[PDB]
Amino acid sequence: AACERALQYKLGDKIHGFTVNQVTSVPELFLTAVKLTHDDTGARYLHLAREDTNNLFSVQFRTTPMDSTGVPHILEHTVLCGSQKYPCRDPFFKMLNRSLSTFMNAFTASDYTLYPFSTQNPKDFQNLLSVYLDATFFPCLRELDFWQEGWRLEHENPSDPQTPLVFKGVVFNEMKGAFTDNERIFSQHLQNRLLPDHTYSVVSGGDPLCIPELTWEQLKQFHATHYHPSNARFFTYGNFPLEQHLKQIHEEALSKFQKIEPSTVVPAQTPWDKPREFQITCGPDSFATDPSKQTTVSVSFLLPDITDTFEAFTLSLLSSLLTSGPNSPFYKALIESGLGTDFSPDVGYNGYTREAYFSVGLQGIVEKDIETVRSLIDRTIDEVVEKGFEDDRIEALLHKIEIQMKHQSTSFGLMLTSYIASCWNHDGDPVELLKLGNQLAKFRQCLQENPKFLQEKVKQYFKNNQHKLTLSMRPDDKYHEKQAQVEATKLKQKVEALSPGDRQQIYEKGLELRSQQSKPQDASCLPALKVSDIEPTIPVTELDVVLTAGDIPVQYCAQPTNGMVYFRAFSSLNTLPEELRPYVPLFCSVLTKLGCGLLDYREQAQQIELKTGGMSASPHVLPDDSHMDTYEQGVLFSSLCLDRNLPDMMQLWSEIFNNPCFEEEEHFKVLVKMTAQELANGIPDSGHLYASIRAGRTLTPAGDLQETFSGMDQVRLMKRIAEMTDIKPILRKLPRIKKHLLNGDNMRCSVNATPQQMPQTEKAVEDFLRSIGRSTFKPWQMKTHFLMPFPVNYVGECIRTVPYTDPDHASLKILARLMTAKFLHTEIREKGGAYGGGAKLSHNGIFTLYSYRDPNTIETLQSFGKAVDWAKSGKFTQQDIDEAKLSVFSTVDAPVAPSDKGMDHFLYGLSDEMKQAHREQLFAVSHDKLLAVSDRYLGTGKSTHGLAILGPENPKIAKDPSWIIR
């Protein structure tokens, strides 16, 4: 096994130029941690050897910007457009089709950047590790790649010099979209204000007004100073041997550098002595939203540095105690006070920065109450100092921590790297941060030996700490108007300062960039795989449906879930009246948080968090793979629990079915308002999803109903519901849904658990099931534009293909991945400047066309017209089809955690006879078939086309009478 061998490194062993410094076991996580340092370049290596296939490698570079120009983000964003060993254009989004990797993506945060990737096939791991090593340590920083990828000047047509020069770029629109997010605006301003001393004072992502002050030479110097491997943290996770990683790294990249000192350390923020206060302004509230109540307030403190692991542990626990749940002091003080609608952005602990900053505050309040809120918060802290915390809540919190320690996930390496990145960015020993068990034992001991421990901590960091702050934000109806005007003024200031020779230079450089883009060029220099590497057969999983008292089919699975238990239960909806369908999402939202039998919502929530590890309920619409318009709707009462707490949880579920409290009204108002706000916030960050859903509404009964359950109609409805003052008519609906959905008539349960816990689970599930009651489609074309005050655009469009078992559906899943990887990724992201775009084939058979953060709309609708023409013409080689197969078979074979194998058969009904049937219709894909399927479905007049676009108002779009404006 990986762990046993990995526990066999002796202190002081030289391994391919590395050195052994510390090895430790982590049994609560079942892994082994190894710390190594290179004898010359000083880069740190962390190896988390753990017996899981999906291995991960990540390289980290501390990027400490000193301005808002946005240099570290663009340096990260551009080194994915060539290098020395692979001078081909775009090595990254070409290796997205020459690898079996399930994750391959890169991140950049305030004071660091980090390139991880995780995969399962060792040869593919070696290939992509070489690609990253070369494409970060030795990139050819073409100025034209900076022009394409960062910011540049360009006419409305690089061929015509008679149209004005505007800014273009991908990072530019990326940040425009990122700061379309009011939460992000607030958090950015808060971090800048509370930490104004040093690098956190400036927008490391670059402000959409301060990007143009960045020049190519600055970028090259930032790279030459920051990406030297003395600023390199290497982190690898999984079962592949260590010698491979170290040998490849040392004898590929590290040998060509020498030791420097990375004078980049972020210094401590100076302590204030007087509480401060500020004011920021943001964009308006989406649609019909009362202008009065849109203010936001915070009171954010300053916690110690995260070099001391235990102090940060204790303060994280304390913040969770103070903020989370209807049993927390600030929930009772602030949330139920009737002023706000939710907590503030970044509420609770935030250890992202060098020093943690607790935050707390409302939003949706009226301005005149700000001092009120402040007083509340201040007063509330006082109360805690004189009371403390109820012991049962502490026990529930520790139980939840234990659950999150034990629950097995598919992507453990990614979570480990994204969890230790911040703490290890600042010379902090990361092994100590992995040992949750040791620190929980320490926490229990320290809490027991002194009863007032948490009271003293709250006093020390909330009473006697002067580094407070009180930020307050207000909506401006013309915030983005002002941003556009100042950007236009900056454009004019930058343009008139240019000689005609430089104008001709810009024009010729734009033409050369266009040539470098649209020229069909080579990619053979990169390593790759073959479809002879995709495994031919997948192992089968053991299922055993067991009818239990008396017609309830109850699947079971025996997985190594580490002593945890995963109950699930799908209950249908066919007998429900049609008029109560829209509120079914609301019913599921409030079902598990209103009162169960003899308990009230605070007691029930304390139970739920004491016994289980979460108890949700969320409607699904599952389509059928033997007919186009056959769908099974229904709610999925998922759950989770430790082994011992199994009957208790099950009793809870019975209580939730038999006796839900539909008369607690104040907490229902609170939950409705809070969740409606939470749905109103999210429309930007998932604009393409909403657009695609509204487009595909009219194609499929399943599509229309999924639009009702999660489309824009849902947020519209919830906004209408949280506005009302009389919530009686809505709370009088819930019994009518409980009497149709909380029974055992049309219900199929499921269980995942270790075999040793299988008979006890049999008994408990049967007890629960005995403890419950036992009582033409014509596709049609619609267009729709949603007026949304955003800078960037979100475009959707759908096509109606054939469902899963149809032979043609198999080939389309290669074409859809083919168009994205070759044609759409170029004519949308690299040319149109968007953040993302392409096509997918939904499991139901909807060929959807989407765009993510698109500066333009009509071109993309036309770029989609050129998408079918390019495919129908067959202008792709045979290896291109070999590329798509390698891609899809890295998506279809994405590893599944013990918690869900197999939930596809339980939900969608895919027996391993039908998966292998489809898996071989994909190996049987040839050039002639892609031509045969493309001209059949995607052609004009061959299907129905539903369109939907989210974005700012546009003259041409609003003109066409063939469009609907909403």
Author numbering: 32 to 806, 847 to 1037
Authors' own words:
Presequence protease (PreP), a 117 kDa mitochondrial M16C metalloprotease vital for mitochondrial proteostasis, degrades presequence peptides cleaved off from nuclear-encoded proteins and other aggregation-prone peptides, such as amyloid β (Aβ). Of the Aβ-degrading proteases, PreP belongs to the chamber-containing protease (crypt-containing peptidase, or cryptidase) family that uses a sizable catalytic chamber to engulf, unfold, and degrade their substrates. PreP-N and PreP-C, in the closed state of PreP, form an enclosed catalytic chamber to entrap and degrade monomeric amyloidogenic peptides, thereby preventing the formation of toxic aggregates. Comparison of the five cryoEM structures derived from the apo- and substrate-bound PreP reveals three key conformational states based on the degree of opening of the catalytic chamber: open (O), partially open (either pO1 or pO2), and partially closed (pC).
Grids were prepared by the chameleon, and a dataset of 3483 micrographs was processed to yield about 175,000 particles from a well-defined 3D class that was refined to a partially closed (pC) state of PreP at 3.3 Å resolution. Similar to the Aβ-bound PreP crystal structure, extra-densities at the catalytic cleft and hydrophobic sites away from catalytic zinc ion within the catalytic chamber of PreP were found when Aβ was present, confirming key substrate-binding sites of PreP. The switch A and C regions in the pO states have lower resolution and higher thermal B factors than the rest of PreP structures. In comparison, the resolution and thermal B factors of these regions in the open and substrate-bound states are not profoundly different from the rest of the protein. The presence of substrate stabilizes switch A, and thus, the residues for substrate binding and catalysis, enabling the catalytic reaction. This suggests that PreP uses substrate-assisted stabilization as a mechanism for substrate catalysis.
